Each structure stands twice: as structure tokens, then as C-alpha cells.
Design a protein around this ligand. Structure first.
Ligand SMILES: C[C@H](CCCC(C)(C)O)[C@H]1CC[C@H]2[C@@H]3CC=C4C[C@@H](O)CC[C@]4(C)[C@H]3CC[C@]12C
Length: 168
């Protein structure tokens, strides 16, 4: 059904972990995801359980404070995230709103995780992303949002791919 996003393909790896286990690791209050957000220096991390009243999907929300490295404005920011899980393995859509940064009103980002089982203890992981503009900033500003966002997005997910790798 649902395809990739018209932005970039961040992750496309095959792991020798079950789709169930891999799903448990990424989309729950797992010690993996805990030890990982700690590793990328995220503070004030707060998770919610998945909703239940819905029939075809579920929803949760996350929040956490992140460090900003790009010499532009604050040296930290808050991030409210919303995840919707569709069981099929599974797929989950993520809306990430970063607050407290420059030009926060201009844009937000979307990400899609695809988990497809392959064998008893083997599954694939795909992650595509895209940038979504509520309003169009002029050339100078937009180039900067594209540049800094994709650098922080790739740096995040590439490290996420490596940590799942060393997890066995
Ligand atoms: C702070 C930067 C860029 C700031 C741009 C500017 C122009 C204010 O310097 C923002 C833009 C997009 C943000 C990421 C969106 C996707 C997620 C995935 C989630 O699991 C964890 C947070 C993360 C990595 C955001 C980090 C901050 C980002 C890079």
C-alpha cells in the first residue's frame, strides 16, 4: 500500500532479528531505544503508551530535548513527536516538530519506518523522510533549512542503523 517519501531514503538494511523483536526495539519503551537516545545526548525523554481505541492503527507521542551544533541560535531545542503504527511486520508514520529553533514555524519533518519480516529471525528495515513547509521561505533561508535538517537527519538515522547492527 503506502510507498516511500519524496525526500530521501535514509535506511535500507536487513537484520537477522525478527520483525517482532526489531519492532519491539524501535517502537516501545525498550532498553535499546532508551540506551540509544541517551547515546545521542537526548534529555527529558518522555514516552507514552500506544493508544488502543482505534481499530486499524495505534498512536503515541514522544518528547525530548536535543542538542544543536550548527552555529545558529540556541544550543538546544525541544522535539514533540507523534507516531502512528499500522500492523501489516509493520509500518509507522512519524511527525516530528522541533520547537525553540530558528524558523520553526516555517517547516516540520515526516518519516516513515517500514518493517517487513523475511524469515524466523530475519527482517528488513526501511526509513524514508521528507521536509514539509507550512510556508515558503526565500532562497537563502530555505537552503539553510534543507542543509542543516538533512545533516541532522542523516547523522541520526545512520547512527541508528549502526546501533541495530551491533545489537544481535
Ligand atoms: C535543529 C534541526 C535543524 C535546525 C535548522 C536551523 C535552520 C534552525 O538551523 C532540526 C531540523 C529536522 C530535525 C530532526 C527531524 C527528525 C528527527 C527524528 C527523531 O527521531 C529525533 C530528532 C530528529 C533527528 C530531529 C533533530 C533536529 C532537526 C535535525
Amino acid at each position: 500500500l503506502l510507498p516511500d517519501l519524496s525526500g530521501r531514503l535514509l535506511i535500507n538494511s536487513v537484520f537477522h532479528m525478527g520483525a517482532e523483536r526489531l519492532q519491539q526495539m524501535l517502537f516501545s519503551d525498550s532498553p535499546f531505544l532508551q540506551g540509544f537516545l541517551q547515546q545521542r545526548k537526548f534529555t527529558d525523554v518522555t514516552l507514552s503508551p500506544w493508544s488502543s481505541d482505534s481499530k486499524c492503527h495505534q498512536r503515541r507521542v514522544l518528547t525530548y530535548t536535543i542538542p544543536i551544533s550548527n552555529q545558529l541560535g540556541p544550543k538546544s531545542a525541544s522535539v514533540v513527536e507523534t507516531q502512528t503504527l499500522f500492523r501489516r511486520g509493520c509500518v509507522v508514520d512519524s511527525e516530528v516538530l522541533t520547537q525553540g529553533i530558528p524558523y520553526q514555524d516555517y517547516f516540520y519533518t515526516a518519516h516513515r519506518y517500514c518493517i517487513l519480516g523475511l524469515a524466523r529471525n530475519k527482517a528488513r528495515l526501511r526509513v524514508s523522510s521528507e521536509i514539509r513547509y507550512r510556508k515558503q521561505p526565500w532562497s537563502l533561508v530555505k537552503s539553510l533549512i534543507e542543509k542543516n535538517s538533512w545533516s541532522g537527519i542523516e547523522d541520526y538515522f545512520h547512527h541508528l542503523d549502526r546501533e541495530l547492527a551491533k545489537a544481535e
